[PDB]
Each structure stands twice: as structure tokens, then as C-alpha cells.
Copies of this chain bind each other. A is one copy, B any other.
Amino acid sequence: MVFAVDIIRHGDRTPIVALPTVNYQWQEGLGQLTAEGMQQEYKMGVAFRKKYIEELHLLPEHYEYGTIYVRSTDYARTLMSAQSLLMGLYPPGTGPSIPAGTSALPHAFQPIPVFSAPSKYDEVIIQQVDRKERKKLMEQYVFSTREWQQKNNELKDKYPLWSRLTGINIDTLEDLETVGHTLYVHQIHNAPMPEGLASNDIETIINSAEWAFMAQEKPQQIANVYSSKLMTNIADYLNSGSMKKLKYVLLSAHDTTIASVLSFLGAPLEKSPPYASNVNFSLYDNGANYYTVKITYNGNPVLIPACGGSVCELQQLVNLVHDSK
């Protein structure tokens, strides 16, 4: 293993939006990484150190300039996720000392830069898409399917009821997604639910929200629009990595990021990426200047139909990404 790229999802977080009908203030603020989420990312970093540094020696024991590049989206939760993980990757005890003295920072913490860009100006991770173009894509590839239509028809009679009880307007199946996600975070943190909302309905809304989310991520043509830039960059990192200084890239991102990438590669999800999810690209030098990339998702090889499995030859992956643009 001569090079690796990790995409991560952030750790456990508070809801993105409040339920208007529920009086409950999240101590951390809305949309924020929790203590539990920090520890998840830290633990992942600890595993990354054991794999990348202790076992494979891809990276050195102490942080070294020019060997790693870390990039996050423009959110507190992904920025803090990257800082938390890097605390595991390069833990207190490994940070620099001042010449002829003691450690630079308390407990010899190691600072590591996490670069970023606003979503509107991100040349690496996030692709901006006009609302009109997004709608066209969805109506062409998602809303127009029998499955989406049937699902909405079976549920829509309860949309006025749920709109009332949640305080969030639900006109279409897509609207159910934000509600279900909030209800889900409330559930697993044991927070108060909207009163009057029957428990089976909560199950239906959460499950429907997951289904609709995954259905929107499913079409490869949409993944091509949203993930082409990110995949182009990742291909370029790997390609550059195959040249006999940089050894590791970490991209701190979202569940959309991961689902769209897997869908891009022809392994679309039907179960939303858990917290601290990880898509990994590892580069291998098979001698004779022949390089391969194995792609893994939460520890399981990704079946990429284009490569007949989870191992692509390098230029095959570069061409695959280019062709889908």
C-alpha cells in the first residue's frame, strides 16, 4: 500500500432542524457533533493509526509536513470530526517539542491543519447544482418511478396529520425525509417526541425517510452530476500517488457524500451510511509499474460492476471516472 484516500462521515450529531411542536433545546446546539460523535471519530483515528502507521508504515510515527492532506466541508460537525479523528491518528504524546526544551503544547498535542472551502466555492468535495437542474434530474430519474409514486400514494393521506403534529409542512414524499431524520435523532437520543404522534407512524416516517433518501441517491446519472468532481479529484490523488511525498488524503464529509460515491461506482445503498462511515481507496504497487486500487466501505469490499469487483486497475479507475463526466 503506497497511498490511501478516506472519505468519512461525521460522528453522532444533534438534529439539523428542531421540531417546532416540541420544546427541547439541544445542549450542543442544532446540527452539531456530540461528545459521543467526537469519541467515534477519535476511535476511528486510533484504528487508522494502528493500520496506516503501526502496521503498514504508510505514514510516519509523528506528523510530518507534506505526507497528509486533510479537507473538510464548511460545517462545524465535519471540521470537528476531522480534528477529533486526527487526535487518534496523531495522539497527544506525539506532538513536537521546542528545541532544547519540553513539549510545544499541553500533553504534547499535535496540531494538524484541516483545510476547507464554502460549499459554493468548493473545488474538491461539494458540487453545487441549481435547484431547477436538481428538480429536472429527480423528476427524470426518481419521482417518475412506479416505486416512488406508489410509496407517496400510500402515505399522502396522512401528510396533513403529520404536518400538524410535527409542525413541518409535508406535501410530498421528499418532505418526509427531513422529518424522519429529526425524529430518528430524537429517538436514539431518547428526546421528547411530538405529542399525539402515534408510535407506528413514527416508525413509518423514519423508515420512509430512509427509503426516499436512498431512492434519491440511487440513480447513477444523479451520482454522476453530484460526485464527478469529487471522484475526479480522488482519481487524481491516487494517480499522483502512484508516482515514485503525499501518502494520505482524508476528506471529512456527509452521508450524502458517501451514498453518492457508492452510487457513482454502481453499488447504490438501500441502508443509510451510519455515523463515522468510511469509504476507503487504497493504492497498491504490484511491481512492474502496474498499480491497483481497492475500494472498501465500512470494512466491506465495494462491488464495482465496471471493475468486476472491488479492485480496479489504476488507469481503469481514472478512465471510469472520466467517462462518467
Contact = CB atoms under 8 A, between A and B. Distances in A.
Contacts of A116: 115-117
A124 to B, nearest CB: 10
Instruction: State the oligomeric state as a number of copies.
Output: 2
A100 to B, nearest CB: 9
Nearest to A26: B65
Interface string A9-40: 00000000000000000001100111110110
A14 B90 CA distance: 22
Interface stretch (A106-114, A171-179, A298-306): A106-114
Interface in A67-98: 74-76, 79-80, 83-84, 87, 91-92, 96-98
Contacts of A154: none
Contact of A39 (B29, B32, B105, B113): B105
A64 B112 contact: no
B29 A66 contact: yes
B38 A105 contact: yes
Given A97-B35, A106-B87, A79 B113 contact: yes
Interface residues on A, range: 35 or more
A121 interface: yes
A84 B106 CA distance: 10
A112 B79 CA distance: 8
A111 B84 contact: yes
A74 B74 CA distance: 13
A254 to B, nearest CB: 15
Contact of A115 (B64, B74, B92): B74
Contacts of A196: none
Contact of A35 (B83, B96, B112): B96
Interface string A101-137: 0001111010111111110010100000000000000
Interface of A: 28-29, 32-36, 38-39, 42, 64-66, 74-76, 79-80, 83-84, 87, 91-92, 96-99, 104-107, 109, 111-118, 121, 123
14 contacts: A29-B65, A32-B65, A35-B98, A38-B96, A38-B98, A38-B105, A42-B105, A42-B106, A79-B115, A80-B113, A84-B105, A87-B106, A92-B106, A121-B121
Given A28-B65, A38-B98, A83-B112, 4 more contacts: A38-B104, A79-B114, A83-B111, A117-B121
